[PDB]
């Protein structure tokens, strides 16, 4: 995020970091319940990637961070790899995340909800802070 700010540690408790098999953060995601994470289809997640819940600082090493294996990836079959439309994938965890103060779920909208143009929302992540 460019021109953002440091989040309060643990205040976005559904935010997860997706790490490849070498330990490299490559994408974010969001817990929707103790067994499932929603992310983007373009991230190309596989069952050799790991879901990291309860993290805020990437350089920290703590047993209080949950590294959760992925049992199966559910890519939406409508995903268009050229236009990037329908950019969503579900990750079914092998073992359930343990919810706590720093690990919990985000709410999902209904397909009929209206989030009006002009509404102030928030985005979070460990992306670059400058290009």
């Amino acid at each position: 995020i460019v021109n953002g700010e440091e989040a309060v540690p643990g205040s976005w408790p559904w935010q997860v970091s997706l790490q490849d098999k070498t330990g490299f953060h490559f994408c974010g995601g969001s817990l929707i319940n103790e067994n499932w994470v929603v992310t983007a289809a373009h991230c190309g997640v596989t069952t050799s990637d790991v879901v990291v819940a309860g993290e805020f600082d990437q350089g920290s090493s703590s047993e209080k961070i949950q590294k959760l294996k992925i049992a199966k990836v559910f890519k939406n079959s409508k995903y268009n790899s050229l236009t990037i439309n329908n950019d969503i994938t579900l990750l079914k965890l092998s073992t359930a995340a343990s919810f706590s103060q720093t690990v919990s779920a985000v709410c999902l909208p209904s397909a009929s909800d209206d989030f009006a143009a002009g509404t102030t929302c928030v985005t979070t992540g460990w992306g670059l802070t400058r290009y």
């Binding site: 969001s30 499932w36 909208p109 002009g118 928030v122 979070t124 460990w126 670059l128």
Partner: protein, 97 residues
């Protein structure tokens, strides 16, 4: 490096798809929602994470970070997967699995 270490956040406005298409044209599809062009931007490594909006005292997932400016420009809207257009599929997948 321009890597952050600690989790970042930013507040930003949702745009209408008509306004988003002023910049991005026909790249904007109905299952996309744009946000930003307000002085903040998502950038490399943010992909897949959340765009949340407060509704009834709680945060709801409205977008999934999808794609945007080549250079993370803060005057161009970011493009997110529009979760309302994809949540029936989410709910169907969870009910069957």
């Amino acid at each position: 490096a321009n890597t952050p270490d600690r989790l970042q956040q930013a507040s930003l406005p949702l745009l209408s798809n008509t306004n988003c298409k002023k910049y991005w044209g026909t790249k904007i599809k109905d299952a996309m929602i744009c946000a930003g062009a307000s002085g903040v931007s998502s950038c490399m490594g943010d992909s897949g994470g959340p765009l949340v909006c407060k509704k009834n005292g709680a945060w709801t997932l409205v977008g999934i970070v999808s794609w945007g400016s080549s250079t993370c420009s803060t005057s161009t809207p970011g493009v997110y997967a529009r979760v309302t257009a994809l949540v029936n599929w989410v709910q169907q997948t969870l009910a069957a699995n």
